[PDB]
């Protein structure tokens, strides 16, 4: 659902990040919070950002004046796993 009112503010909100670079794609339901300087080229990077060496995370920059396509949306993903265990979650 749209949350432009709650998440964006004047001059843009920079508290929300996303990872732009990673050595490999994520496995399903994986979380990578490492901030290693991503090596995009043949240069070593030596732990400092620079030529072909970028910070892995990036700021969304939610301006209130942004188009619908660039407005902050909040997402909730419900996963219903059924294993060989007692089913402990049910409804009416």
């Amino acid at each position, epitope marked *: 659902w749209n949350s432009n009112n709650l998440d964006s503010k004047v001059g843009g909100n920079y508290n929300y990040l996303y990872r732009l*670079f990673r050595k490999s794609n994520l496995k399903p339901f994986e979380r990578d919070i490492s901030t290693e300087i991503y090596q995009a*080229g043949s240069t070593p*990077c*030596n732990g400092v950002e620079g*030529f*072909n060496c970028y*910070f892995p995370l990036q700021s969304y920059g939610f301006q209130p004046t942004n188009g619908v396509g660039y407005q902050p949306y909040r997402v909730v993903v419900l996963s219903f796993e059924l294993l060989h265990a007692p089913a402990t979650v049910c409804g009416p």
Partner: antibody
Amino acid sequence: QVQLVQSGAEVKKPGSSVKVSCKASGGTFGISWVRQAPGQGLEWMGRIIPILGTANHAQKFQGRVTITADKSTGTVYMELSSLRSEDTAVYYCARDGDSGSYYETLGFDYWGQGTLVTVSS
Amino acid sequence: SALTQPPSASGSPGQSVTISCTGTSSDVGGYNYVSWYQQHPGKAPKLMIYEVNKRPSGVPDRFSGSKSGNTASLTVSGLQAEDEADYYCSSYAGSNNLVFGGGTKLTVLG
């Protein structure tokens, strides 16, 4: 339609500050600045990737170069302060990669026209 | 300064000229980000070679880049009068450092 248009033909007294603009047209990943003294060779100054926020300086220009960009206008500014007679040169923009391909080739594809900054008393 | 490029290479039409660009292990020898620019007097530089051997879209096949140890080399094969210009080499000197050469004034003799 991938041209870089450089503004300005400014003259500045020694010790003042100059700000040169580059307007990018078409897709441009990062814009670098290269200066050339009259008669002398090329020397690198700095690089900016507006989509990422990183900026670079050559060691010799530490404390003197400020490279900014405004995405609303699509332009990139480079400010050199504490000018002296050594700085009188032509300042060029340079494209570093197309709008995609977050790679940097360190070869500058398209160059703007000259921006001559004459520093004199 | 910082690179050794011979100021004054010359050649003849049809022949081939090899312009050298000598660095050290830490700039030219170690990494593969080397560029050759051609600049006609009064005009802006134009990219001829990037990443050692890569010709960009619109550069004739005459210009061929190469590298050996600490020396990059640009070879002009199909020399014409138009090639009379200043040729600079640039290389990666480390994170946040790019180094240019002194420039070579290529003179076509014929």
